Amino acid sequence: SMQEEDTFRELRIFLRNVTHRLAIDKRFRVFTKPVDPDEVPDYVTVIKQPMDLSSVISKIDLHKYLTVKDYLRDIDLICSNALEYNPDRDPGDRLIRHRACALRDTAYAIIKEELDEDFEQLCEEIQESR
Ligand SMILES: C[C@H]1CCCN(S(=O)(=O)c2cc(NC(=O)CN3C(=O)CNC3=O)ccc2Br)C1
């Protein structure tokens, strides 16, 4: 219905606002663009499911997220890909991992303060009903 379409439009508006606030954080610049295949050849071979904030924006716009749960799966993938590809003890890898965990914690904390649980629950019930 029109009412359900209004619900998903509000969700996309919410998800773009949260994603924008992550993307302008200087700590998360590395997560704003896909890994450039030129600069990093073995990324696409090692990370099976690349994800970054530019892809999250594209997915919002293609209506790929019907719930904040589904969006947070992609935030969690940006973090787990970073931990997976940069696992070493050296400062380079420890910095990326620290940033990856801060992106995940910041997204979860924004949503905890600003997502109405009844709004999420409506999104889940419309999604389940399809
Ligand atoms: C090859 C690794 C270097 C450290 C960052 N990781 S990552 O897995 O945390 C990751 C990166 C990007 N995007 C970029 O690194 C984009 N980029 C370049 O490729 C060169 N400069 C630049 O900013 C996106 C998501 C993740 Br999870 C990739």
Side-chain angles (χ1 to χ4, degrees):
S1 58
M2 162 74 98
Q3 307 86 232
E4 290 183 348
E5 286 327 300
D6 291 352
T7 303
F8 290 137
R9 182 154 190 273
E10 182 165 346
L11 173 62
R12 296 193 293 273
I13 294 167
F14 180 69
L15 291 184
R16 283 184 204 102
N17 176 269
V18 173
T19 308
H20 175 73
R21 284 148 74 185
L22 298 179
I24 62 182
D25 190 314
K26 261 165 209 158
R27 298 174 290 171
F28 311 144
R29 194 197 41 71
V30 65
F31 310 120
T32 60
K33 306 182 299 303
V35 174
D36 177 33
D38 311 306
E39 260 164 304
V40 187
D42 75 293
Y43 196 78
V44 161
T45 73
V46 173
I47 300 307
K48 292 308 167 183
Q49 215 175 355
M51 188 52 55
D52 71 277
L53 296 174
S54 66
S55 303
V56 171
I57 294 298
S58 303
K59 291 186 62 172
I60 292 167
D61 285 354
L62 290 164
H63 300 191
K64 294 295 191 198
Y65 303 122
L66 291 197
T67 69
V68 177
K69 198 176 172 178
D70 284 355
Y71 171 86
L72 284 176
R73 282 201 184 81
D74 277 349
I75 300 302
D76 286 339
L77 192 59
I78 298 172
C79 179
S80 55
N81 291 349
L83 298 203
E84 176 186 336
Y85 191 77
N86 310 272
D88 296 351
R89 65 130 312 260
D90 64 79
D93 284 18
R94 280 191 181 154
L95 176 58
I96 299 150
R97 290 204 305 278
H98 185 270
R99 282 165 171 179
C101 287
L103 175 75
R104 177 172 175 175
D105 295 344
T106 299
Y108 271 79
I110 293 167
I111 282 155
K112 186 187 194 185
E113 284 208 306
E114 302 181 21
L115 179 59
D116 186 301
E117 282 183 347
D118 293 338
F119 180 85
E120 181 55 7
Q121 186 64 40
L122 177 58
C123 286
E124 290 182 12
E125 290 180 14
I126 299 165
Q127 186 195 49
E128 286 144 49
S129 79
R130 305 183 165 183

